[model samples]
Target: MVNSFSGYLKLTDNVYIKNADIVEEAKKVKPTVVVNAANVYLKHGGGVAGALNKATNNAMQVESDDYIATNGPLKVGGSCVLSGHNLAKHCLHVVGPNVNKGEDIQLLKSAYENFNQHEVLLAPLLSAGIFGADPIHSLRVCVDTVRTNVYLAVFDKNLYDKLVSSFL
Candidate 1:
């Protein structure tokens, strides 16, 4: 089910904890675009990037690599829009901060800021997975940064509860 809070929407499936399937939630929202936290390298082995890659039949990675080859590595806070290949109308890959490398909150916010507003957008808890961030904090950054109607796909109940309480 989908619920509205603050300036965005929160959608979840039946599962709790780590079972919040991004692709399934995205499909329900039918967003015009889906945004994933990605590195410049565009490697999609785990996290939301990996789910999106598989959902798109591996097209996302191919296009991401091609985009990088032509334009170079996507800078932190930079983004690249690619064809969604049946997942959504467009796919936006935003290069988020690497927490392990000492990237700060400002840089993390920039990743969400880079998103161009679409009618509807589905985004993961940016920088929270492979980036080793606090999911609640990262989600707050996203809610503050995005300019349009965004659906945040959250996997953890604790994180979800915090987001709803804080934002709503």
Candidate 2:
């Protein structure tokens, strides 16, 4: 379901911390489209929560809520949470395997079964790196786990491209 963007497009060179620079990049590229990829965990509060809340509260933003359907546990995909002035777009949130078992192919499979749709995907540092699995291995696990049509390895671009591509 996932493929490399290397052949189609190259990312613009820019210093970014998480999704912080996305807005700026959009301005420069004047993209007709902006896709914010993310996964949400009720218990963990999701990665984009803090930033989204902050922007919403600070700027008094208003946004419409849109929902996407999927086969995952939550059943909602590509939903948007509007908080004041800021709007947080949702991709697909699948609560699958624990990060501790990075080597288990079954974990990946379970995750894939949980998600039925594919547009964009985000890999948190903890899931892909901090959990003791090497980044590339973690990505492989993720790619194996999701049924999405499109996936983006959101961390360590070089490692993601090199190692994951080698497998393909």
Candidate 3:
């Protein structure tokens, strides 16, 4: 269910920090839209992208690749919408900053700031997983940036618990 925390709706029932099994959770919540922390190249290498690939049976990946091929490399903080192919009605592929590549926090924050709003959305702590960014910081950025009904599909149990205690 939805819990109000500090002026925003946060759902922790299906949330597990750093768990990595989002496909099942997505099915249960059936979010109208899911946000994928993607790269400019739109490659589903690991982390959220990989999970989404498996969940949508590679359809999202193929579609993302097709998008890059047809259009161009997705710019930093830029987003492209894709058909969820039955997983969800839509998937928003947003290119997050690569901390490993010297991208700054401003860019990372911009990524979250650029997200398209939806009624019910499934988002992750941007750049915390595969990109190796700090979870708590990223999560706070997410909470502060988005002003919609958002369910943060966390995977790290510690972070999940921390968020619940801190926000709930």
Assess the local accuracy of residue 141 in candidate 2 as a C-alpha lDDT between 0 and 100.
52
Which candidate wins on TM-score? 3
RMSD of each: 5.3, 8.6, 4.7
lDDT tens per residue, model 3, 89-136:
788888778887787766777787765356556777788876767777
Each candidate's TM vs. the true structure?
0.80, 0.42, 0.82
lDDT of 1 by residue, 1-168 (tens): 243223334433211122356677666555667788888777877888898899888888888888878888888877888887767778888878888778775788888876645545667777888788777777667656666656666766666667666641
Residue-level lDDT for 60 in candidate 1: 81
lDDT value for model 2? 0.34
For each candidate, the alpha-carbon lDDT, in order, equals: 0.70, 0.34, 0.71
Error of 3 at 39 (Å): 1.0
lDDT value, residue 164 of candidate 1: 66
Residue 145 Cα positional deviation in candidate 2, in Å, after optimal superposition: 4.7
Off by over 4 Å in 3: 1-20, 166-168
